[PDB]
Write a protein that binds this ligand. Structure first.
Ligand SMILES: Nc1ncnc2c1ncn2[C@@H]1O[C@H](COP(=O)(O)OP(=O)(O)O)[C@@H](O)[C@H]1O
Ligand SMILES: Nc1ncnc2c1ncn2[C@@H]1O[C@H](COP(=O)(O)OP(=O)(O)O)[C@@H](O)[C@H]1O
Lengths: 438, 305
């Protein structure tokens, strides 16, 4: 019912110019190994990419990274149409500007540091209005294509002139920053994400379904695991990734308000999540609010839990809002929070495995220049019981250590850090060694 | 009429052979597009009923006869001098249907119903909490015959060794007082729920209060089969669906479990079928929801999570 309509799935290839289909689909569509394609999605939007084959992709689905997925205004699960675009040709001019909130903090020649490397002999196809990301100098810069000579699409070839007229455009509301949490910023968890994903899929993406249906979707999702496991990161991603409205509640934070002023906040919070539903309410250190078991004691401490219980049971309505909480383990939480209609779903986010760390390591080093001697697999292999928060700290320390030896001693700090400088600096295996040895 | 995962209520506005007739293959059926508004004295069928409860039987038999006279024949007690049971306590783990049971007996007996929830009461400010208990009891009496169901009771009365608070105690006592305060004209019965005796304040047992107890265990094999049926009556089940099997493998489940199991099997079905064809987020079409059928495969997926 249109051989060219596919379900936007996740990417295997992190490159902004490629999208993957399955060979049988490439046949049915008569597409080849490197063909440039025209992709149509929502809000009457389009994108141009290179299509490769992917034996793990299904005939119906299409793999595409978050950059393209945004250029198209679609979320995972959504459907787009694909059409060949052989008529595309070498670009003449190209005007692009950086998105202001992605270059604050730096000064220098971005073109040299970012554009030049990014395009260089890659022949990336671009459509006007495209927004693309480029990583370097320990950060990522967002660029919008303001206009292309062969309009509205063309390939950026070694001859294509690239204008970058010095004024950073301001981001437009409906243009989510790529610097946002995504499923692509989570590693290790997979089965857990698979579960959570399907749990919120319908209620958060197809609300009307529940207006017309009589079945009950899961209402509360509880996340188990030690600190720095990515529970918050996971919840924030599912929200972003699903266009859902997000509202974070933090125990310590709530539990520091004066008696009564504390509950007024819980309610004001829930009350707001509903205003913007579909929404996800994430209670951070939950056990900081609901421990009741044997450890609860206080004509306020108890008055709060009860308040949370009430607020929980208060859910159930139109566009649904789901509640996600986090704690280290069952035992911590008030048994009352389990009572079905409340936190009736549970997900245990263990500690990554060897592969999981390798994955996590990659995610946290994507914006930095790693020397060829850097062996992340080794690093992954020796960090047995680490959790994401650990690995991230490990990367952060290896980079700061690198910054202290190199840049630091030459001394070009405390001023207005130059991109070219930060861009040249490379973290070495020696730098990770230093970090792993503290 | 059940379908598309819901039930629609229809009123017969007029029949040709009036006022009664048979609807035969030839009978024309008009359905002129305007949905009439329900009339107060026309209880929705979408209400809890004894027919929405499965597993319990002996317990319902008991509770039924307990409230029969006081809630259906109040004058009897105006003319008589005997005392009807005053408080009915419901024992059992979570999701056993205690609330459902109490709500049904009320509906089913034309009784006025008023739900009180511990967590809910126990979240009001000190004093503001008791004012509510009283306002609640006070209202149940205004509309007697009535049934007052205190939900998580132990959330209000645990006193044994676990009570501690110049408010926590002030509340229980308040409940005790309110209990003893009953006894009047058209009687109102109080029903509470907890997981077990031990949880509750021993004071609540003192005869004239919660003097009657009913233990709602976990369903048996037949009980689950029953419960399963109740929660799948509005959905289209494929011929391969074997509820008896499903019932047979869910040993220690309770109604809340089985209901969740059905809900998940249907949402799973909705995600494969409808979902991928993609006809959601708009204004869901009956015909669509009506065609979709949950398969044994869908219950398998649910039972395997
Ligand atoms: N699975 C993961 N993938 C990538 N980074 C992770 C992961 N788990 C943790 N992290 C890193 O650790 C920090 C962990 O904190 P957070 O997400 O708040 O987790 P938690 O709620 O368990 O403390 C995150 O911001 C992220 O940088
Ligand atoms: N015996 C039963 N028959 C049918 N459904 C049941 C039964 N017991 C529980 N359920 C389902 O589980 C949910 C159980 O919650 P509830 O009635 O509030 O029970 P409890 O008060 O024990 O938590 C009910 O709304 C109903 O959908």
């Amino acid at each position: 019912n249109r051989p060219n309509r596919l379900i936007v799935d996740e990417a295997i290839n992190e490159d902004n110019s490629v999208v993957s289909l399955s060979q049988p689909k490439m046949d049915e569509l008569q597409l080849f190994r490197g063909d440039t394609v025209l992709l149509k999605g929502k809000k009457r939007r389009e994108a141009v990419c290179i299509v490769l084959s992917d034996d793990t992709c299904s005939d119906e689905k299409i793999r595409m990274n978050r950059v393209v997925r945004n250029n198209l205004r679609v979320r995972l699960g959504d459907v787009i149409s694909i059409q060949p675009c052989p008529d595309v040709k070498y670009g003449k001019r190209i005007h692009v500007l950086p998105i202001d909130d992605t270059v604050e903090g730096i000064t220098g020649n971005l073109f040299e540091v970012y554009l030049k490397p990014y395009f260089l002999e890659a022949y990336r196809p671009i459509r006007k209005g495209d927004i693309f990301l480029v990583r370097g100098g320990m950060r990522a810069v967002e660029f919008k294509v303001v206009e292309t000579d062969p309009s509205p699409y063309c390939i950026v070839a070694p001859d294509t002139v690239i204008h970058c007229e010095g004024e950073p455009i301001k981001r437009e509301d409906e243009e989510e920053s790529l610097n946002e949490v995504g499923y692509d910023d989570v590693g290790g968890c997979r089965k857990q994400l698979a579960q959570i994903k399907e749990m919120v899929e319908l209620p958060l993406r197809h609300p009307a379904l529940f207006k017309a249906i009589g079945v009950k979707p899961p209402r509360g999702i509880l996340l188990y695991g030690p600190p720095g496991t990515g529970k918050t990161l996971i919840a924030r991603a599912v929200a972003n990734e699903t266009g859902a409205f997000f509202f974070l509640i933090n125990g310590p934070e709530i539990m520091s308000k004066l008696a009564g002023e504390s509950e007024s906040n819980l309610r004001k919070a829930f009350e707001e999540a509903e205003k913007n539903a579909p929404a996800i309410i994430f209670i951070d250190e939950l056990d900081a609010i609901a421990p009741k078991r044997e450890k609860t004691h206080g004509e306020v401490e108890r008055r709060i839990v009860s308040q949370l219980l009430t607020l929980m049971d208060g859910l159930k309505q139109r566009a649904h809002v789901i509640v996600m909480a986090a704690t280290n383990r069952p035992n911590s939480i008030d048994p009352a929070l389990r009572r079905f209609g409340r936190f009736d779903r549970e997900v245990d986010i263990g500690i990554p495995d060897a592969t999981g760390r390798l994955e996590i390591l990659q995610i946290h080093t994507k914006n930095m220049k790693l020397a060829d001697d850097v062996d992340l697999e080794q690093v992954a292999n020796e960090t047995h019981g680490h959790v994401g928060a650990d690995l991230a700290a490990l990367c952060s320390e290896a980079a700061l250590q690198a910054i202290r030896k190199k840049m630091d001693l030459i001394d070009l700090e405390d001023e207005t850090i130059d991109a070219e400088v930060m861009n040249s600096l490379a973290v070495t295996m020696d730098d990770f060694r230093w970090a792993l040895s503290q």
